[PDB]
Amino acid sequence: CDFTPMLVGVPPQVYNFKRLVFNLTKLLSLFMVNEFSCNGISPDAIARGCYSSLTVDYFAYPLSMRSYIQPGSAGDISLYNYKQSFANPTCRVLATAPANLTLTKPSAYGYFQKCSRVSGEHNSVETPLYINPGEYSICRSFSPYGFSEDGEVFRRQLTQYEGGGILVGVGAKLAMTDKLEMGFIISVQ
Amino acid sequence: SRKTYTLTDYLKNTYRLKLYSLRWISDHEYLYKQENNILVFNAEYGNSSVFLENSTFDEFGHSINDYSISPDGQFILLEYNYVKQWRHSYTASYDIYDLNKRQLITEERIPNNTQWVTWSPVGHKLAYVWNNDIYVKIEPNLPSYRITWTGKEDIIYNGITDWVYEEEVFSAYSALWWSPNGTFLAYAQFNDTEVPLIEYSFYSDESLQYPKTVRVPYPKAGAVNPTVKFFVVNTDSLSSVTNATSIQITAPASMLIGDHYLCDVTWATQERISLQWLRRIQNYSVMDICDYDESSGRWNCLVARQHIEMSTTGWVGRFRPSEPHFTLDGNSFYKIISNEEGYRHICYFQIDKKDCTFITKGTWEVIGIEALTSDYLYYISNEYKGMPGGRNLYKIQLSDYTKVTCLSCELNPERCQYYSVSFSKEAKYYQLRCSGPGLPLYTLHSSVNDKGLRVLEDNSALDKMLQNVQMPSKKLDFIILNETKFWYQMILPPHFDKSKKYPLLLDVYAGPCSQKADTVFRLNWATYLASTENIIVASFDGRGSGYQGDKIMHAINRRLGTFEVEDQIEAARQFSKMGFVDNKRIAIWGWSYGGYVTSMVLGSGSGVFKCGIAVAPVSRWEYYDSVYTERYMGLPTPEDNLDHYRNSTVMSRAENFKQVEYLLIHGTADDNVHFQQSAQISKALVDVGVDFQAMWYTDEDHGIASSTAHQHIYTHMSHFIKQCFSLP
Amino acid sequence: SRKTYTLTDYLKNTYRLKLYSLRWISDHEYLYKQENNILVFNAEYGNSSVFLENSTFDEFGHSINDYSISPDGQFILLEYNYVKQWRHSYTASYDIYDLNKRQLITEERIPNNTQWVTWSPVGHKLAYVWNNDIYVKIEPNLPSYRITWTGKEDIIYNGITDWVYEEEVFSAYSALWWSPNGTFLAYAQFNDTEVPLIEYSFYSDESLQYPKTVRVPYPKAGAVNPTVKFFVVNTDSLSSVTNATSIQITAPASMLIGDHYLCDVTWATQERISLQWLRRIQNYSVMDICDYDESSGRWNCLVARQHIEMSTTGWVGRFRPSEPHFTLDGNSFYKIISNEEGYRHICYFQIDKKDCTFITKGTWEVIGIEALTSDYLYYISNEYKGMPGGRNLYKIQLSDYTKVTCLSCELNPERCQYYSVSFSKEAKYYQLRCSGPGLPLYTLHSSVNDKGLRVLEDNSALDKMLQNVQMPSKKLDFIILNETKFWYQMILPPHFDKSKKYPLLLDVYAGPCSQKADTVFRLNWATYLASTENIIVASFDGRGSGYQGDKIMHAINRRLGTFEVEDQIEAARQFSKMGFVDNKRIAIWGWSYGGYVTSMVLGSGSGVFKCGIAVAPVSRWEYYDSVYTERYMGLPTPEDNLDHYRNSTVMSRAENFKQVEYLLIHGTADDNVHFQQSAQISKALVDVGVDFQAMWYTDEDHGIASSTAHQHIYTHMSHFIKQCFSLP
Ligand SMILES: *[C@@H]1O[C@H](CO)[C@@H](O[C@@H]2O[C@H](CO)[C@@H](O[C@@H]3O[C@H](CO)[C@@H](O)[C@H](O[C@H]4O[C@H](CO)[C@@H](O)[C@H](O)[C@@H]4O[C@H]4O[C@H](CO)[C@@H](O)[C@H](O)[C@@H]4O)[C@@H]3O)[C@H](O)[C@H]2NC(C)=O)[C@H](O)[C@H]1NC(C)=O
Ligand SMILES: *[C@@H]1O[C@H](CO)[C@@H](O[C@@H]2O[C@H](CO)[C@@H](O)[C@H](O)[C@H]2NC(C)=O)[C@H](O)[C@H]1NC(C)=O
Ligand SMILES: *[C@@H]1O[C@H](CO)[C@@H](O[C@@H]2O[C@H](CO)[C@@H](O)[C@H](O)[C@H]2NC(C)=O)[C@H](O)[C@H]1NC(C)=O
Ligand SMILES: *[C@@H]1O[C@H](CO)[C@@H](O[C@@H]2O[C@H](CO)[C@@H](O)[C@H](O)[C@H]2NC(C)=O)[C@H](O)[C@H]1NC(C)=O
Ligand SMILES: *[C@@H]1O[C@H](CO)[C@@H](O[C@@H]2O[C@H](CO)[C@@H](O)[C@H](O)[C@H]2NC(C)=O)[C@H](O)[C@H]1NC(C)=O
Ligand SMILES: *[C@@H]1O[C@H](CO)[C@@H](O[C@@H]2O[C@H](CO)[C@@H](O)[C@H](O)[C@H]2NC(C)=O)[C@H](O)[C@H]1NC(C)=O
Ligand SMILES: *[C@@H]1O[C@H](CO)[C@@H](O[C@@H]2O[C@H](CO)[C@@H](O)[C@H](O)[C@H]2NC(C)=O)[C@H](O)[C@H]1NC(C)=O
Ligand SMILES: *[C@@H]1O[C@H](CO)[C@@H](O[C@@H]2O[C@H](CO)[C@@H](O)[C@H](O)[C@H]2NC(C)=O)[C@H](O)[C@H]1NC(C)=O
Ligand SMILES: *[C@@H]1O[C@H](CO)[C@@H](O)[C@H](O)[C@H]1NC(C)=O
Ligand SMILES: *[C@@H]1O[C@H](CO)[C@@H](O)[C@H](O)[C@H]1NC(C)=O
Ligand SMILES: *[C@@H]1O[C@H](CO)[C@@H](O)[C@H](O)[C@H]1NC(C)=O
Ligand SMILES: *[C@@H]1O[C@H](CO)[C@@H](O)[C@H](O)[C@H]1NC(C)=O
Ligand SMILES: *[C@@H]1O[C@H](CO)[C@@H](O)[C@H](O)[C@H]1NC(C)=O
Ligand SMILES: *[C@@H]1O[C@H](CO)[C@@H](O)[C@H](O)[C@H]1NC(C)=O
Ligand SMILES: *[C@@H]1O[C@H](CO)[C@@H](O)[C@H](O)[C@H]1NC(C)=O
Ligand SMILES: *[C@@H]1O[C@H](CO)[C@@H](O)[C@H](O)[C@H]1NC(C)=O
Secondary structure, X not given: OOOHHHHOOOOOOOOOOEEEEOOOOOHHHOOEOOXXXXXXXXXXXXXXXXXXXXXXXXXXXXXXXXXXXXOOOOOHHHHHHOOOOOOOOOEEOOOEOOOOOOOOXXXXXXXXXXXXXXXXXXXXXXXEOOOOOOOOOHHHHOOOOOOOOOOEEEEEEOOOOOOOOEEEEEEEEEEOOOOOEEEEEEEEO | OOEEOOHHHHHOOOOOOOOOOEEEOOOOEEEEEEOOEEEEEEOOOOOEEEEEOHHHHHOOOOOOOEEEEOOOOOEEEEEEEEEEOOOOOEEEEXXXXXXXXXXXXXXXXXXXXXXXXXXXXXXXXXXXXXOOEEEEEOOOOOOOEEOOOOOEOOOEEEOEOOHHHHXXXXXXXXXXXXXXXXOEEEEEEEEOOOOOEEEEEEOOOOOOOOOEEEEEEOXXXXXXXXXXXXXXXXXXXXXXXXXXXXXEOOOOHHHHOOOEEEEEEEEEEOOEEEEEEEEOOOOEEEEEEEEEEOOOOEEEEOHHHOEEEEOOOOOOXXXXXXXXXXXXXXXXXXXXXXOOOOOEEEEEEEOOEEEEEEOOXXXXXXXXXXXXXXXXXXXXXXXXXXXOOOXXXXXXXXXXXXXXXXXXXXXXXXXXXXXXXXXXXXXXEEEEEEOOOOOOEEEEEEOOOOEEEEEEEOOHHHHHHHHHEEXXXXXXXXXXXXXXXXXXXXXXXXXXXXXXXXXXXXXXOOOOOOOOOOOOOOOOHHHHHHHOOOOEEEEEOOOOOOOOOHHHHHHHOOOXXXXXXXXHHHHHHHHHHHOOEEEEEEEEEEEOHHHHHHHHHXXXXXXXXXXXXXXXXXXOOOOOEHHHHHHHOOOOOOOOOHHHHHHOOOHHHHHHHXXXXXXXXXXXXXXXXXXXXXXXXXXXXXXXOOOOEEEEEOOOOXXXXXXXXXXXXXXXXXXXXXXXXXXX | OOOEOOHHHHXXXXXXXXXXXXXXXXXXXXXXXXXXXXXXXXXXOEEEEEOOOHHHHHHOOOOOOEEXXXXXXXXXXXXXXXXXXXXXXXXXXXXXXXXXXXXXXXXXXXXXXXXXXXXXXXXXXXXXXXXXXXXXEOOOOOOOEEOOOOOEOOOEEEOEXXXXXXXXXXXXXXXXXXXXXXXXXXXXXXXXXXXXEEXXXXXXXXXXXXXXXXXXXXXXXXXXXOEEEEEEEEHHXXXXXXXXXXXXXXXXXXXXXXXXEEEEEEEEEOOEEEEEEEEOOOOEEEEEEEEXXXXXXXXXXXXXXXXXXXXXXXXXXXXXXXXXXXXXXXXXXXXXXXXXXXXXXXXXXXXXXXXXXXXXXXXXXXXXXXXXXXXXXEEEEOOHHHOOOOEEEEEEEOOOOOOEEEOOOOOOOOOOOXXXXXXXXXXXXXXXXXXXXXXXXXXXXXXXXXXXXXXXXXXXXXXXXXXXXXXXXXEEEEEEOOOOEEEEEEEEOOOOXXXXXXXXXXXXXXXXXXXXXXXXXXXXXXXXXXXXXXXXXXXXXXXXXXXXXXXXXXXXXXXXXXXXXXXXXXXXXXXXXXXXXXXXXXXXXXXXHHHHHHHHHHOOOOOOOOEEEEEOOOOEOOOOEXXXXXXXXXXXXXXXXXXXXXXXXXXXXXXXXXXOEEEEEEEOOOOOOOOHHHHHHHHHHHHHOOOOEEEEEOOOOOOOOOOHHXXXXXXXXXXXXXXXXXXX
């Protein structure tokens, strides 16, 4: 339907990605693209209204952080921010927005390099909290809009229904590029 | 009669021991300085060649302080314009002189006021810290590459430590660790933004109208501690058009939940590093072993490879957790840790397995691991003769732990019982440095058959000179207290007669993990006192001392100022009971922690001691730095340990000083033990009415190490001791 | 046998000197505070009445430090929460109590931390300084009007002085001058922006774990001095709606050409004010007389009404130019200026005309003008018996200058020789306070016939108490050095024998315009030393001393530490030559300037003195403040007088200290003579290799005056003196 909302305002970070569930696909001409890869249905195949559902997740994402998002990756991004789900056919875009668009740049790019739970005899046992392909991050609540400076350490006391330990999260910051690079995934149902 | 050791003999340093300081530049070769030259030596045969000559130094307009050798031997690094800052930190100017070309390098020189300079372990790469920022030169003539851009004075430190770290955590100014072959440079960044500053005045030279205020970020007990980060940079990918990329290695989450320290950095292989982190409550420590991933250019520390080191009865380590010693493959290492009995012994670790196996056992402690080759490990321990104050070199067989051989026990038994060693680059030759009861002796040995090659330094001239001097003697024995042996030493006057009664001076430090009773030859103030004034100078190792097990050492835990003081007093009582000690003339003196113990003893109201001297003493434990104080006492909060913090002050005992004579000395520019402590002691003593003697030393640090101030302080203390003992 | 004056008697103050402090509220009434309540006394025939009771003081919760009475007698000002800052400055809280309604005035109260409060000379107008700003209360219950808005802490001072003005120029914290009938309020504004600050550490109460740095704007010798402006405000025009306007009175044109000082403010009439300005080179001063102009609202300062005081041989005044004493009509005034022969005397001026007629002459000096009346002038002078140390009250007819009568020369000649005076509002009753050779005596007189009314206090009880004890005796005499008499005083021990030999201690100040040899009865540390320890304590008045002409006082101009040192040494030589002084046992001691003279005497290498004590001594004249040092030495520039600034230094002579025993005492929180001065003395002595003794005092000002600190320091110096003379 209408894809105006993704375009307007400040785009969100990778770990705090925003999903719109709904056709068209004219908007890919709006900005330069770089990666249209898919694991299910191949790109350029659109059924218009025949699709049962259409979900998109979008987020500001630098192009230097490219090898860390793949069908198979071992890095901070997949482990703690965003792992792609292959149950439904998806397509990565990783396009670069141009100038003179209604897109206010974020201050900087941000992602979480560590996010674990501490609980033991004397806070000894460390349990990394790896995220699911379809779920958000437990460490999202630490600065959803990004970090100021690099290597921030956040901590909180987890309550019940979450494990009941101490959640520790470390974030990383990469300075913004001259033009805003963003990332999309399009899952067709 | 014959000559004695006088005060001018000690102050003017008439009799001087000689040393043989060498730098192994190879498995079979080393450099030695004699007659202002640089001579390279062959360890196997003993012949020497002139590495650097006399006339080379004279062409510079400046005076060279120190020299450094490139591992390939192509470049010297000459240090001049030395300016000292703290115990380990300084600034200097450096110039690089080519040894093949025989010329100074005048293009792109190292800037002035450089805080630290270091060579790579191989090659001729240079990393130096200037203005709290790290620069790397791939070649001495090419321009340097700026690694960090965040350096700021008294706020951000890159590659160099802040005061509290340099004083208590690292005992060094450098925070740079090169890779084993120099491909990576690891460094720590410190942040002193919220650390409070200590302010004291510095008068300077008399031409200065207004004194300067010195502001040092100093975290006192319970204050805000510095923040540390760790980065590794790849020096093989440095470019002139791109800023260097530093990959940060974060602490384990068991430390990120609160305040913590970085305690040790040790490279295992070319792409593995080990990092040791300690909590502010310094009884929990974790070693993190991180590897380099070549796909990502990132370093990853697995959870399974973390090693926990905790202490239930005290703190972790003697002062800090010990250093690991990895094997060649880097998959295992040896560490000295405390056993169930409480004795420090070498335990064998696997990088990925939690349990480690002890290879040494006993009612003795391993002092340090010296070299680790294949099939043999070299270490220093006080196993021999049960004497805690002796040091001897042992080697153990890795294929069979039951084959332990002492390499220095029977070399010269009477004269040598305190040993230190330095091995070659492949541990093929080692120099045995002895400083035992006799004169120090330096010998060279080959480890292939443990045979002695030659004697490097015999101290024959000093032996010849000392035959015409009535010299004092040292006795090392023990006393039994509650079925526990506690060791003491006694500097006895010449022609010592047990029948006669002598005045006794108790030299005390009594700090945690300290050893004042050992078999070490010294020429100090106590020699003069015993040789000339016929005063017995005694030192005692009580509860809280080191190298005797955790039971003795950890008795002081959270109770500083209680057991060491009582042990000193009971030792004095036993000494007076021995029969040759004048009970009326007994004194106690100490420096730093020894000054605190002296003041506590004098305020104890025991009546044993006639007088005492405290030099730069600690008065209140809330005035001292956070790392040292919280290692032993904890936080000064009402929940944790504030009451002892309040009960263990020298001020509280000011009423009891009316029964003793007190000499209190401090240097005004002290940055370790601030003048505030002595000022508070004196203020308390004036309030209660006690008459005492004081002396401030203008512009003098903790050591009071300037020649004039050193001579003045020892002359003043000798005058005070002579007056106390009524010595004619 | 009998008791003596012991150290406890001095320290515990067993023998109290009773005083009669009265405040003349009116021409014939005064307030006296006995038994903790204020009483009104009729000066004619006693007739005492109770003004306030003790129960009223009990009402308010806090303790009252001081009280001030409104001139109309309707209000009282109660001062509490007293907190001292410097020698003359403090902060306090104030409460106003109505004396007719007998209640507190709780509305529109004076704020806390008030720096200065003063009543108008008539009525109940109130002006106070808060946060360096001036507020005026027309009535004690109505709101206050803010006068100045530019007050800034340590930068801009309105109505109060800065450090240097309070210490050296005005000798007071107040820079407020009410009009004679309370219409105008004159004030001075001080700007210390470019004045450099002195910083020293304040180790506060033991609970403070980080010492505080005290920053005080302090102009040292040759540094930027504070700048001043003078304003007069009209308090009758003050309105709530508008801001008040202040009219500035500028310095003369001859004074604005460089740095200058405001040294005196006096109101001549209800619409005329006189100001004295002094140059930075303090040998030139100008008096500016200015009249209010009703139409303009402005103050006009005529050039013809300017009087110039010059000094070719030295500085102007004793410490500052003297104040004028105007007549009732304000067209003429009397001032004490130096005559052609160098002796200060009263000269009669006319505001319009330059020439001044001297009304007194002779080889003696006038100490001050006490009261002026239509018919007579009262003054204090040392004319009687030709003794510079005595003081007596005189009177001179204004219609015949020949008729001069002494009002206190023969009242009790033996007991009283040092007089001071307080005169009633119309000068018809005065209180004479003698403190001469005998015990202090207070009497009341009436000016109409100079008759004695009654004795207010005779110190009979101390006389009864001092008969049992053994007291020393003071001898005051003179010696001839070069055809001139210099006066000395000696405290002779009880049962003094001329054939016996005694140790001698030299009590030294020897500052410019000083008198250590006078006829004043004191109970101090010398009484103990003479009474108990049988030590002669002697003082000398040599060159540079005051009250004996300008030829003696100006002899040390631009040469400080030269003639007074040699004069003290020659005095000690003459004392030893007198016959009853042990030549082996001679000591010298002093405070402040006296400590400087003691240090230079000890470093002179004369060999006369065995030991010495210097308490808070000046070491270098470039470390002291600008006004005091440049009054006597000039500027420390290579143009005029840098050479003597470098020559006159205690450090220069540190090599001569080997032959003496030295005690150096200083307080760490000294703001007058900073600790840096002793810290440099000690550094020089340690560098040379001199054995000496030192003692710091934590948080102690120039006068080390606490209970504990004072007792401790005098006990310590008594111990040092007893060790010097080998006393039991
Ligand atoms: C050496 O140590 C000192 C002291 O520890 C370091 O200085 C501190 O630096 C941190 C930065 O990490 C700083 O904390 C920020 O302060 C800002 C100003 O007070 C705050 O605005 C900011 O909060 C925002 O950012 C957080 C993420 O860091 C968010 O979680 C938070 O919700 C806030 O969110 C705002 O910003 C986002 C955009 O990021 C925006 O979209 C939101 O709407 C919202 O407006 C941080 O709290 C400390 O104040 C500093 N302390 C000082 C100076 O005393 C110093 O950096 C260290 N030096 C080095 C080299 O490491
Ligand atoms: C490397 O980093 C430094 C600092 O991060 C860069 O220097 C900054 O450059 C910008 C633009 O030229 C200036 O506005 C800043 O003032 C500079 N800061 C400092 C501290 O010098 C530098 O440009 C970077 N180099 C490269 C090649 O990117
Ligand atoms: C120094 O050690 C590094 C790390 O082992 C070596 O770098 C590797 O060299 C091998 C062989 O040339 C390459 O396959 C790797 O990709 C290199 N890794 C990195 C991170 O550079 C380097 O060769 C060594 N230098 C010597 C031995 O001179
Ligand atoms: C390190 O020391 C602290 C302080 O002594 C220990 O914390 C104590 O733990 C015991 C047992 O859990 C409690 O009973 C105490 O109340 C704790 N004290 C405080 C102040 O919290 C801690 O357990 C030690 N860590 C170890 C031994 O690993
Ligand atoms: C106090 O003195 C300072 C300097 O002596 C004054 O500041 C100056 O103000 C003038 C404005 O007339 C500026 O031109 C100068 O540049 C200022 N100098 C400095 C050093 O700041 C200040 O105005 C004075 N304050 C008062 C109340 O008189
Ligand atoms: C009296 O003078 C003061 C200061 O000159 C005035 O206070 C200022 O008023 C202006 C305008 O309201 C403000 O912008 C300033 O911030 C004020 N400064 C201060 C220090 O208060 C005050 O308004 C004047 N009063 C009258 C009646 O004119
Ligand atoms: C205090 O003295 C002042 C100054 O002489 C008096 O003020 C003048 O008073 C006269 C007569 O009342 C007026 O004509 C003038 O205009 C006033 N001048 C000023 C500047 O106010 C004042 O009256 C005196 N007050 C008292 C109570 O005597
Ligand atoms: C106040 O003292 C200064 C400094 O001593 C006098 O200035 C000197 O004046 C004489 C005579 O003109 C010159 O020879 C000197 O060179 C001046 N010295 C300096 C440093 O300038 C000044 O004359 C004195 N003033 C009075 C009124 O006596
Ligand atoms: C080098 O100089 C020192 C003193 O300057 C001298 O003793 C020594 O003999 C010299 N070296 C040689 C090889 O002569
Ligand atoms: C010592 O002599 C041997 C020959 O036996 C030689 O190989 C070696 O290089 C020499 N060492 C030095 C330092 O000259
Ligand atoms: C160090 O200072 C000296 C003296 O000013 C100067 O000649 C030299 O060039 C400086 N060194 C560098 C590397 O700038
Ligand atoms: C230390 O002093 C505090 C303060 O009274 C007290 O509560 C505590 O019991 C004392 N500790 C000991 C061991 O006496
Ligand atoms: C005492 O003084 C009061 C006024 O204060 C007066 O009324 C009274 O008459 C005086 N007493 C005499 C004169 O006896
Ligand atoms: C008023 O009270 C004080 C107590 O401070 C007491 O000394 C004095 O005697 C009392 N006055 C009278 C008249 O009793
Ligand atoms: C002064 O301080 C006290 C105590 O804080 C307070 O009660 C009083 O109101 C203050 N005075 C004024 C004038 O604010
Ligand atoms: C200071 O002393 C030197 C000698 O050291 C002398 O030449 C000079 O004239 C003196 N300056 C004075 C007294 O102003």
